[PDB]
């Protein structure tokens, strides 16, 4: 058996050309950042992970190295299940908060343990998880068309992503619902019925404006309505779902652990659970959430948006899961999606395949890592919701 | 009008002699720690606060100075309501997590803004809040008799607090329910019916063991059963409450914002909301939670346990609130209760009075602060629940 010797958190920042910054309810993007988690062992088998973002990099680094890390040093990394609970009950729930950046931190470490396990076994993570369900590949969507566009421009951008091979894409909404509606109408007219259009309000709407928008989304045949409301308003989501439209009510990037999703399910408040393996507790926790969605006859389609590691970690699980595929793929300017690792976007008939190597299944460019150390740059401007 | 110039977070640690270290489901106490928040203005009016604990001090310091702080610099501190929302929607909810150490961090800053406001106005916080309801003083309880005692020892400790003037005290339970039961029985026999006995399991029990223990709490006429279960199991709390006993089901030190408590209320799952002004969002947020409890014909009795600032902040609110008083007073070894400030425990006929000075109502001993800089010591050993 191996023993964990170090838990490291590398803070990384990559720039965004001013014109390529995009804004949603989450704020105006400034620099694409991440923590690259590195778990080392006595025999030199290493796993890597990411706790997603945007979350302050110093907060993440401290939580990972100095709160979670000490619970892992000296432990057999093979006992991922034991270690999840040791960390959650020993430190994170009480001492970082039960639905928190500490849970995202745990997630990054958990992903690294799964990567380590796959590397030790010389198997891709999806093989450990029972192998593929989606044997031919996983249907992806282009994430996302952001604010600050006219309707013709939104339609142009959608048509562009479709030309690149995407069969689905997402639109950010929430600031100016009349403009959002005009954008959606133009988008649908441009591409026709065979392209799925998803909408994401980043918690920007109140209940009544969300009900008004849902009518529009229904008219436009939208696939889902993501974060239509504050994630704190469970009943509001039930109200939207109770309208009985074919538009799925989706949320989950900002909800943590299976406990959050259980509360939504018990209140008939969710169609699509979007728990991200890199945020909601780890691969370990996302597995449980995906299963719980299926038990309730609901869907799990994770949020994946931060870096190529968060994408890859979720993709292993999605490939292995019988849930209908609607796999988030960040198409915005992001060096962490292109230059961090050897795994790249490749669409065939609208589908992507999980990485095929051991663990997460690709190689990290450590020269790139060394050249992009964080120097205190901000990731994102102030969010909305006031 | 003033302008905020600096938001500082002083990391402090104070030791606990070996024999004085107590253990509960939250862990074995090692050092009593805090962040002392200091908000400065251009005209030299300063407010202080605390975001409670245990939470990692470096995580807190970074969140306060470098995540929350930048949203405050240059702002008029008088607009506490505006600033709460600027911070929550701008940064904390999404970028630190909606039920998180970030919320505790916000709470410390919010308390400091209220302290600053009171100092600027030359009024105690309770006067701003509409003045006293509890004009004669606030009934307190001794917090707490911890694990590791025999029944005779538990009864003697309780009798000791009664001799000191307390009309109520709390017992920690959950590791060995048969011993817990024996302790309670001995305690009740010793003091008779006129002393309130509270019980706190620190999330240690599952549903069936909690139902079994509730029968014994009922037999012993206990006032409340605090954190009987994981705070993530709302339905389990409903089950306990549905037994219809005179024992109140209490939770809240580990639940964040009014949203958590609304979910408990909507599920008929809570009798006593324990939202702490220094954890759950601030004085601003605790005010709303207290009001919401009253609207639902339930009680708000805050958790207050970390330092004299968290005690004082809650006491101003409790003094002003019509809720029946059951005010938590940390009687364990804690230099942050005795040496940080000029305000101390003064029990008269079982009651305490809020500080009478401006703002929080006492002065900080800055020499003590300077002499107790954190040097990386841990606050608490691994918690339980696994
Ligand atoms: O000592 C402990 O068990 C905790 O740190 C406290 O917060 C406790 O739950 C309480 O109600 O004051
Ligand atoms: Mg567990
Ligand atoms: Mg989203
Ligand atoms: Mg608000
Ligand atoms: Mg407690």
Q: Do A385 and B235 touch (CB under 8 A)?
A: no
Contact A217, A199 (CB under 8 A): yes
Question: A238: burial class by Cβ within 10 Å (0-12, 13-18, 19+)?
Answer: middle
Question: B73: burial class by Cβ within 10 Å (0-12, 13-18, 19+)?
Answer: exposed
Residue A97 Cα distances to A104, A342, B105, B292, angstroms: 11, 35, 11, 23
Residue A85 Cα to ligand 2 midpoint, Å, equals: 5
Q: Which of residues 128-187 of A touch B (CB under 8 A)?
A: none
What CA–CA distance (Å, rounded) separates A311 from A319?
Answer: 12
- Residue B34, chain A, CB below 8 Å: the answer is no
Under DSSP, is residue B379 helix (H, G, I), strand (E, B) or coil?
A: coil
Residue B377 CB coordination number (10 Å) = 12
CA angle A212, A216, A220 (to 5 degrees): 165
What CA–CA distance (Å, rounded) separates B103 from B280?
Answer: 6
Task: Produce one character per residue of B7-33: b if its CB has 16 or more CB atoms within 10 Å, e if not.
Answer: bbbbbbbbebeeeebbbbbbbbbbbbb
The residue assigned the tokens 């952001």 is A146
What CA–CA distance (Å, rounded) separates A303 from A127?
Answer: 22
Residue B132 Cα distances to A21, B124, B203, B260, B356, angstroms: 52, 11, 33, 27, 12
What CA–CA distance (Å, rounded) separates A44 from A12?
Answer: 23
Q: What is the 3-state secondary structure (H, E, C) of B212-247?
A: HHHHHHHHCCCCEEECCCCCCCHHHHHHHHCCCCCC
Residue A300 Cα distances to A164, A270, A317, B364, B372, angstroms: 26, 10, 10, 52, 49
Q: Which two tokens stand for residue B96?
A: 């630190």
Contact B117, A121 (CB under 8 A): no
Which residue ranges have their beta carbon within 6 Å of ligand 1? B 24, 26, 143, 200, 202, 253, 303, 305, 328
**Nearest CA among B279, B328, B331, B253 for reference residue B25:** B253
DSSP A325: P
Contact B49, B111 (CB under 8 A): yes
**Nearest CA among B83, B84, B75, B52 for reference residue B3:** B75
Phi, psi of B317 (to 5 degrees): -70, -45
Domain residue extents for chain B: 1-122+366-386, 123-365
What CA–CA distance (Å, rounded) separates A313 from A212?
Answer: 36
**Nearest CA among B325, B323, B313 for reference residue B354:** B313
Phi, psi of A324 (to 5 degrees): -60, 135
Which residues does B153 contact at the CB level (< 8 Å), separation at least 6?
A: none
Contact B196, B326 (CB under 8 A): yes
Element (H, E) at B310: helix B308-320
Contact A203, A171 (CB under 8 A): no
What CA–CA distance (Å, rounded) separates B143 from B145?
Answer: 7
- Residue B229, chain A, CB below 8 Å: the answer is no
Q: Which two tokens stand for residue B298?
A: 């339930």
**Nearest CA among A385, A100, A144 for reference residue A254:** A100
What CA–CA distance (Å, rounded) separates B310 from B275?
Answer: 12
What CA–CA distance (Å, rounded) separates B135 from A171?
Answer: 57
The CATH number fitting domain A1-122+366-386, selected from 3.30.390.10, 3.40.50.300, 3.40.50.1110, 3.30.530.20 = 3.30.390.10
Q: For this experimental structure, what is the resolution in angstroms?
A: 1.3
What CA–CA distance (Å, rounded) separates B231 from B233?
Answer: 5
Phi, psi of A30 (to 5 degrees): -120, -50
What CA–CA distance (Å, rounded) separates A6 from A279?
Answer: 22
Q: Measured on CA atoms in the order B99, B104, B109, B113, is the torsion positive or negative?
A: positive
Residue B336 CB coordination number (10 Å) = 25
Question: A148: burial class by Cβ within 10 Å (0-12, 13-18, 19+)?
Answer: middle
**Nearest CA among B364, B379, B385 for reference residue B8:** B364
- Residue B215, chain A, CB below 8 Å: the answer is no
Q: Per this entry, what is the length of chain A?
A: 386
DSSP-assigned states of every residue in A73-121:
TTS-TT-HHHHHHHHIIIIIHHHH-SBSHHHHHHHHHHHHHHHHHHHHH
Tell me how far apart the 2 most distant CA atoms of chain A are, in Å.
60
Residue B267 CB coordination number (10 Å) = 16
Q: What are the DSSP E strand ranges found in B187-326?
A: 196-200, 224-226, 248-251, 272-273, 299-300
Contact A158, A141 (CB under 8 A): no
The two beta strands, B272-273 and B248-251, are: parallel
Q: Per this entry, what is the length of chain B?
A: 386
Q: Could you check whether B1-122+366-386 and B123-365 share the same CATH topology?
A: no
Residue B138 CB coordination number (10 Å) = 22
Taking phi over 0 as left and psi of -120 to 50 as alpha, with beta for the rest, B300 belongs to: beta
DSSP B64: I
What CA–CA distance (Å, rounded) separates B325 from B127?
Answer: 18
Q: Do B56 and A63 touch (CB under 8 A)?
A: yes
For residue A199, which ligand has an atom nearest its CA? 3
CATH superfamily for B123-365 is Enolase-like C-terminal domain (3.20.20.120)
Residue B369 CB coordination number (10 Å) = 17
Q: Which of B86, B88, B96 sits opposite A55 (nearest CB)?
A: B96
Contact A239, A211 (CB under 8 A): yes
Q: Do A95 and B263 touch (CB under 8 A)?
A: no
Under DSSP, is residue A131 helix (H, G, I), strand (E, B) or coil?
A: coil
First-last CA distance in chain B: 52
What distance lies between CA A338 and its chain's CA centroid? 17
CA angle B352, B251, A287 (to 5 degrees): 150
What CA–CA distance (Å, rounded) separates A319 from A50?
Answer: 19
What CA–CA distance (Å, rounded) separates A114 from A107?
Answer: 11
The residue assigned the tokens 């965004």 is A16
What CA–CA distance (Å, rounded) separates A257 from A277?
Answer: 10
Contact B72, B78 (CB under 8 A): no
Contact A322, A138 (CB under 8 A): no
Q: Which two tokens stand for residue B282?
A: 């601030």
Q: Which residues of B touch A231 (CB under 8 A)?
A: 98
Contact B12, B345 (CB under 8 A): no
What CA–CA distance (Å, rounded) separates B237 from A369?
Answer: 47
Which residues does B291 contact at the CB level (< 8 Å), separation at least 6?
A: none
Question: B339: burial class by Cβ within 10 Å (0-12, 13-18, 19+)?
Answer: middle
What CA–CA distance (Å, rounded) separates B168 from B165?
Answer: 9
Q: What is the 3-state secondary structure (H, E, C) of B1-55?
A: CCCEEEEEEEEEEEECCHHHCCEECCEEECEEEEEEEEEEECCCCCEEECCCCCC
**Nearest CA among A18, A52, A21 for reference residue A35:** A52
Task: Produce one character per residue of A102-136: b if its CB has 16 or more CB atoms within 10 Å, e if not.
Answer: bbbbbbbbbbbbbbbbbbbeeebbbbbbeebebee
Element (H, E) at B338: helix B335-338
């Amino acid at each position: 058996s191996l023993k964990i010797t170090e838990v490291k958190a590398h803070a990384l920042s990559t720039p965004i050309p001013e014109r390529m910054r995009v804004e949603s309810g989450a704020g105006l993007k400034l620099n694409r950042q991440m923590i690259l988690v590195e778990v080392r062992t006595d025999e030199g088998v290493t796993g890597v992970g990411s706790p997603s973002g945007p979350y302050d990099l110093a907060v993440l680094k401290r939580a990972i190295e100095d709160v979670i890390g000490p619970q892992l040093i000296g432990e057999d990394p093979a006992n991922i299940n034991y270690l999840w609970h040791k960390v959650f009950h020993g430190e994170v729930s009480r001492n970082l908060g039960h639905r928190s950046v500490g849970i995202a931190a745990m997630s990054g470490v958990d992903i690294a343990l799964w990567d380590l396990k796959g590397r030790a076994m010389n198997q891709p993570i999806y093989q450990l998880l029972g192998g593929k369900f989606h044997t031919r590949g996983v249907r992806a969507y282009a994430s996302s068309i952001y604010w600050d566009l006219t309707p013709d421009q939104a339609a142009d951008e959608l048509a562009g992503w479709v030309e690149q091979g995407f069969t689905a894409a997402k639109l950010k909404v929430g600031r100016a619902p009349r403009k959002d509606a005009a954008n959606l109408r133009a988008m649908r007219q441009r591409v026709g019925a065979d392209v799925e259009i998803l909408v994401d309000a980043n918690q920007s709407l109140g209940r009544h404006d969300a009900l008004a928008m849902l009518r529009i989304l229904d008219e436009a045949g939208c696939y889902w309505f993501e974060e239509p409301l504050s994630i704190d308003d469970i009943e509001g989501h039930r109200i939207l779902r109770a309208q009985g439209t074919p538009v799925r009510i989706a949320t989950g990037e900002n909800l943590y652990t299976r406990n959050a999703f259980n509360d939504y399910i018990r209140n008939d408040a969710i169609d699509v659970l979007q728990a991200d393996a890199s945020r909601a507790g780890g691969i370990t926790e996302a597995l449980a959430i995906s299963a719980s969605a299926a038990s309730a006859h609901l869907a799990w389609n994770p949020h994946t948006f931060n870096d190529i590691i968060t994408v890859a970690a979720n993709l292993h699980l999605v490939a292995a899961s019988p849930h209908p595929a609607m796999f988030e793929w960040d198409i915005t300017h992001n060096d962490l999606m292109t230059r961090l690792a050897s795994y790249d976007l490749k669409l065939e008939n609208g589908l992507v395949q999980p990485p095929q190597g051991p663990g997460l299944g690709f190689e990290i460019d450590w020269d790139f890592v060394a050249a992009h150390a964080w120097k205190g740059e901000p990731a994102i401007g102030a969010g909305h919701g006031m």
